[PDB]
Each structure stands twice: as structure tokens, then as C-alpha cells.
Amino acid sequence: SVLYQTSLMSALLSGVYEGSTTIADLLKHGDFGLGTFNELDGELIAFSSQVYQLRADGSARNAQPEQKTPFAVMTWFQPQYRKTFDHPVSRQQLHEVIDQQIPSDNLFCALRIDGHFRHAHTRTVPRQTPPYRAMTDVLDDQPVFRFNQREGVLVGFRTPQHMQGINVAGYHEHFITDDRKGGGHLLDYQLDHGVLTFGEIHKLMIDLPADSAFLQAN
Amino acid sequence: SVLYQTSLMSALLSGVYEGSTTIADLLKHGDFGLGTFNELDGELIAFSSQVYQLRADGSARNAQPEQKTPFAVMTWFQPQYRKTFDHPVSRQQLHEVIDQQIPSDNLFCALRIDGHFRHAHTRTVPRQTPPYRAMTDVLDDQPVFRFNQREGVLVGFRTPQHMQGINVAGYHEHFITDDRKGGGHLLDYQLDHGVLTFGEIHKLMIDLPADSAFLQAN
Ligand SMILES: [Cl-]
Ligand SMILES: [Cl-]
Ligand SMILES: [Cl-]
Ligand SMILES: [Cl-]
Ligand code: NA
Ligand code: NA
Ligand SMILES: [Zn+2]
Ligand SMILES: [Zn+2]
């Protein structure tokens, strides 16, 4: 597997909120991943080549192939490991399981959970119009949604510390409900029971765009 | 074109001086590039799929396909631009030509010069045995070799500032003489006349190794 990254987190955070890459373009280089939509209109979650748009009101909907993204990370998911949990386990305990199995922080990880979540707390960015406010101020204003006792799917990546300028260092995880109508970017969660599948990734492709805003960003 | 990078500069600088990637492996993903040999036994220069080993005594020799590298950057060279210089031009003037043509620091550049150099000054790392001394102290001790009025070839890359942890930010250029028996890592040069060919690169593949020293490096 190759982690295929569209653009750079530094470019996104600098104010480059639009790109020309479509959701269909993303699915050329993976069936699994995360990212942001143009104008920061929420975030995407993708697994088994199904893509959904998660928005600031807690909603999820099917992503359309023509929608565009300024930043995303995709892969052809090829997990090496599977662990079933029959009793409650916290996000941080699950990360401890992954980190024991893949202890080098110098590798990436892709992870998926299918199961029943005791709770899943989410906060997702709303669509932005320029001039842009500081991202931290936008996040201060966004409600946290709390999904309680819901079946659903989690998609995530673990990014090395040696990558903080380029991508989201540490764990980045998104959630969607079984009915595919709710979800968001995860702040914390606890799994009541479910199946974790995950694997390490050694290869990263960074595709730098050609739009003028990216080229002129500092 | 894709800039194909073997490992990380941060790993090399941390003391990971050996890898399992061979020169033949490098040529699977390019015909052009630069890098370091195992044990820091000099550096490589590659152009038109010819690879040479440049060592601390100023010498160049044909690189053997079975030799291994802990760090390298390769591409299938596809320049978009050609400029002939009939009168002397300094390294920094040449970089000004490139930077005017490719002004976004957010893109990579690959560059090649074929011509007659007024001078080319080089300093190249010697083979190291552990425990390793600080790289800066090793470089303090290495002689600078001065190639005067020599025909030769220059190979180089320009790396964005948004990449300093991962690769050599700015320009990184190596030189070899026409007889292929002298060369090194360039500190400065002046071209008397010659041909510059160069182009921009938007895609970077990072291939992270699996050897234990890389996995355990901080
Ligand atoms: Cl249940
Ligand atoms: Cl997250
Ligand atoms: Cl001449
Ligand atoms: Cl250089
Ligand atoms: Na968000
Ligand atoms: Na050197
Ligand atoms: Zn997110
Ligand atoms: Zn060098």
C-alpha cells in the first residue's frame, strides 16, 4: 500500500481551501481514507470505495464523485492485523494495541473499526468564505456532537511525528453511523464491542497541485 | 515525473548510515538523481541511467549496481526548459534563472548542466565507522577540491522549504568531470559556457525502509 496525499496540511492551514481534485480522482488511488472538502465544507470518510461527506451539523451524506477537495489522504487498504473486542475498549486503549503491534513511530498506520460504539464525540469544520477567520477560532464556535450507543464505522490514519508539516501528526479518525446519516471528525470514543483491522504503510506519495493559490502560498 | 526518495534525511542524520536499497533498485524509479552510499562512503551522481560514486579524495568511479544506499533521490528526468549560456555564469545566477522560471518554492526542480566549468568546488563525506562523530565535525576535517577549467556534468535538485525534515532544503548539486574520474558534492561553481536543462516536479514518493535501525531511530 501507498498513502496517497493530495496537497499539504500547511497549504490548507495557510488558507488554500480549494483544489481541483475530485472525489473520483481520489478513488483512483485508494478505497479508504480521509480529507476535507472545498471551501472547508466538512470532511470526507472513505472505506471500501464508499465516500461520505460529514458536515458541521453532525450529518453524513453520500459524497458525489464530482465534489472537490483541497486536501486528502487515501490508500488501497491492506490490513495485516485483525482483533475482535467483546468488551468495552477506549480509543486510547485501542491505540495502545496498535502501537504495540506497530511500535515504530516512523511508519504510518491505517485502521478501521466496525462495531457498536458506547459513544463517539465529533466536531467538524463548517463551510468558510474569505477573508477567513483563524481555524482555531472557527473550531471554538463549533458544537460537539455525541453519538451514543450507535453501530458504525471508523476510518483512521496514524502519522509519524517526522511528518508534522505535511500531514496531521498522530491519529486522525473519522466516524459514520450504520444508517450513514450521522458522523464526523472524532475527538474521543469508546467501543462497546467490534472488530479492529489495521496495518502498517511504508510508502507516501505527495501530489502537489498546480492552482495559483497553492503555488503562491507561504 | 515523480521524485522517488529512499528513506529520510532525518534518519540519515540520526546515524542510520546503512540501507538495503541497491543502485539497481534506485534505477527502477529513475535515470537521474543523487544520494549517499552505505557507511557514508561518498555520494552518488546519476544521469541518463549512468551512476557514479564520488568519494572524499575527489575521485569518481563507476558505481556498481549491487552497491547499497541509506538515502537517495531519483527521478525519470523530463526537463521542460533548456537554456544555453555562451558566457560565464555563476551558480547563483543560474539558480536565479531557474527560480524566475519556477518561482513557486512549493514545487521541486530537477536540473542538469553539461558544459565547461571555470571552477567547481567540492567537499564529500568519507566512509564512517561507529560510534559516529558529529557530521559537522567530520565535514570540518574534509578537504575542498577545486576543479579548474573542466568539462563535466552537474546534476541537482531544488527542494521546497516545506520539506526540510524530509530532504535537503534548497539546492543540492553534484559534479563529475568529462573523464568520469573526478567529482563531488558541490559547494560553489561558475560555468564558463554550457547548456542548462531543468523542469518542475509536483509528485514526491517517500519509501520508508524496514531495517531495524530505521525503525528504532528518533
Ligand atoms: Cl451491541
Ligand atoms: Cl481524529
Ligand atoms: Cl570551453
Ligand atoms: Cl550542493
Ligand atoms: Na473538521
Ligand atoms: Na558529502
Ligand atoms: Zn478530520
Ligand atoms: Zn550531496
User: Is B2's CB within 8 Å of A205's CB?
Assistant: yes
Maximum Cα–Cα distance across chain A? 51
From CA A198, how far away is CA A102, in angstroms rounded? 10
Nearest Cα neighbor of B172 from B191, B188, B186 is B186
DSSP β-bridge partners for residue A62: A52
**What residues in A contact B217, CB-CB < 8 Å?**
106
CA end-to-end span of chain A: 31
Query: In angstroms, what CA-CA distances link B212 with A129, A159, B187?
Result: 48, 19, 33
From CA B111, how far away is CA B171, in angstroms rounded? 10
User: Is B162's CB within 8 Å of A162's CB?
Assistant: no
From CA B11, how far away is CA B17, in angstroms rounded? 8
Q: Taking the mean position of all CA atoms in its chain, how far away is CA B22? A: 16
Centre of ligand 4 to C-alpha B169, Å, is 10
Q: Which residue has the cell 481555524?
A: A135
From CA B48, how far away is CA B46, in angstroms rounded? 7
DSSP β-bridge partners for residue A58: none
Which phi and psi angles does A100 have, rounded to 5°?
A: -70, -35
Q: For residue B44, what is its C-alpha cell?
A: 552518488
- Determine the residue of chain A that is closest to B165 in CA distance: A162
State the smallest CA–CA distance between residue A20 and chain B in angstroms.
15
Residue to mutate among A25, A73, A159, A162, with most B CBs inside 10 A, is: A162
User: Is B162's CB within 8 Å of A214's CB?
Assistant: no
The upper half-sphere exposure of residue B143, i.e. CA atoms within 13 Å in the direction of its Cβ, equals 9
Q: For residue A167, what is its C-alpha cell?
A: 500531514
**What residues in A contact B202, CB-CB < 8 Å?**
207-210
Centre of ligand 7 to C-alpha A43, Å, is 6
- Determine the residue of chain B that is closest to A201 in CA distance: B208
Supply the Cα-derived Rg of chain B in whole angstroms.
16
Chain B contact for A210, CB < 8 A?
Answer: yes
Q: For residue B149, what is its C-alpha cell?
A: 577549467
> Resolution of this PDB entry, in A?
1.6
- Determine the residue of chain B that is closest to A10 in CA distance: B162
User: Is A205's CB within 8 Å of B209's CB?
Assistant: no
Chain B contact for A133, CB < 8 A?
Answer: no
User: Is A208's CB within 8 Å of B214's CB?
Assistant: no
**What residues in B contact A217, CB-CB < 8 Å?**
106
Query: CA triplet A55, A115, A183: central angle to 5 degrees?
Result: 5
User: In chain A, positions 73-112, which contact chain B (CB-CB < 8 Å)?
Assistant: 104, 106-107
Neighbours of A145 (CB within 10 A): 19
Chain B contact for A67, CB < 8 A?
Answer: no
The single-letter code of the amino acid at A153 is: V
Q: Domains (ranges, CATH) in chain A?
A: 1-77+201-218 (no CATH), 78-200 (3.30.1330.80)
Centre of ligand 4 to C-alpha B186, Å, is 4
**Is A84 buried (19+), middle (13-18) or exposed (0-12) by CB count in 10 A?**
exposed
Q: For residue A18, what is its C-alpha cell?
A: 480549494
The beta-carbon neighbor of A107 closest among B162, B202, B208 is B208
From CA B118, how far away is CA B188, in angstroms rounded? 11
- The ligand minimizing its distance to the Cα of A171 is 2
How many residue contacts between A and B have a Cβ separation below 8 Å? 64
**What residues in B contact A2, CB-CB < 8 Å?**
205
State the smallest CA–CA distance between residue A26 and chain B in angstroms.
15
Maximum Cα–Cα distance across chain B? 51
Centre of ligand 2 to C-alpha A215, Å, is 28
What single-letter DSSP state applies at residue B161? G
From CA A207, how far away is CA B75, in angstroms rounded? 15
Note whether B183 and B52 are within 8 A (CB): yes
